[PDB]
C-alpha cells in the first residue's frame, strides 16, 4: 500500500517466530534489529550513524515477513533503540518513494 | 517521480543560494544539514540515532527546494556526515512510501 509520512512509517514484521514492529527506513543501507535470539553463525560488524558507531552481529539468509511480504536477507542485530528495515530488504518487497 | 531504492535516494536541494545533495530519509523525524551558513536566530537542540546524540542548531522557516518542489520548514544544522531530508519536509512535498 501507500504510506504517507505524517507518522513514523512503522509496520509489523515477523522474524524467527516473533512479532515485532519495525520502521521502514530509506536512509538505512542495512536492516538492524534490537537484540533478539537468532540461530546460525554470525560475523562481527560495525555500523555508523549520527552520534557514532555500534557493534552489531550479522546474520545471512534470515527469513522475514514485512507486512505480508516474505523476503530473505542479511539482518543485523544490535543496540538500536528501534527496529529498522533498510534498503537491502525494502528493494525485495519492491518498496519505492513517490512524490 | 518514482524512486526505487537500489541506490541511496539522493536528490538535489537548494538552500540559501547553495546547491547540495541530500538523502530522502523516511527514518528521520527532522531535517538535518551539514554545517553551513544560515541567517536568523537559532535554538540549541539535541538529536539522537544509532551510536549516540549530537548538538544541532535549529532554524525555523527556512525556504528549501527539494528537487523542484519548494517547502518551508524547520531545518537543523550539525555534525552529520550526510545531508538528510526528514519527514517534517517530506510531507510538504507529498512524499509517500509505496509497495
Ligand atoms: C540505521 C543505520 C544502519 C544508518 N546508517 C547507515 O546506513 C550508514 C550509511 N552506515 C553504514 O552503511 O554502515 C556501513 C559502513 C560501515 C563502515 C564504513 C562505511 C559504511 C543510519 O543511521 N541512518 C540514518 C541517516 C544517517 C546516515 C549516515 C550517517 C548518519 C545518519 C537515518 O536514515
Ligand atoms: C537522522 C536523525 C534525525 C534520526 N534520528 C531521529 O529521527 C530520532 C527519532 N531522534 C529524534 O527524533 O530526535 C528528537 C528527540 C530528541 C530528544 C529525545 C527524543 C527525541 C536517525 O538517526 N534516524 C535513523 C534511524 C534511527 C532512529 C532512532 C534511533 C536510531 C536510528 C535512520 O533513519
UniProtKB/Swiss-Prot annotation, chains A, B:
Complex and partners: Homodimer, whose active site consists of two apposed aspartic acid residues.
Catalytic residues in the record: 25 (for protease activity)
Region of interest (Dimerization of protease), ranges: 1-5, 49-55, 88-99
Descriptive protein name: Protease
Transmembrane segments: none
Domain Peptidase A2: residue ranges: 20-89
Function, as annotated: Aspartyl protease that mediates proteolytic cleavages of Gag and Gag-Pol polyproteins during or shortly after the release of the virion from the plasma membrane. Cleavages take place as an ordered, step-wise cascade to yield mature proteins. This process is called maturation. Displays maximal activity during the budding process just prior to particle release from the cell. Also cleaves Nef and Vif, probably concomitantly with viral structural proteins on maturation of virus particles. Hydrolyzes host EIF4GI and PABP1 in order to shut off the capped cellular mRNA translation.
Amino acid at each position: 500500500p501507500q504510506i504517507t509520512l505524517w507518522k513514523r512509517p512503522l509496520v509489523t514484521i515477523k522474524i524467527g517466530g516473533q512479532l515485532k514492529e519495525a520502521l521502514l527506513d530509506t536512509g538505512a543501507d542495512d536492516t538492524v534489529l534490537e537484540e533478539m535470539s537468532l540461530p546460525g553463525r554470525w560475523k562481527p560488524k560495525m555500523i555508523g550513524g549520527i552520534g557514532g558507531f555500534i557493534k552489531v552481529r550479522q546474520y545471512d539468509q534470515i527469513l522475514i515477513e514485512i507486512c505480508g511480504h516474505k523476503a530473505i536477507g542479511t539482518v543485523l542485530v544490535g543496540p538500536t533503540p528501534v527496529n529498522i528495515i533498510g534498503r537491502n530488504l525494502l528493494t525485495q518487497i519492491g518498496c519505492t518513494l513517490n512524490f
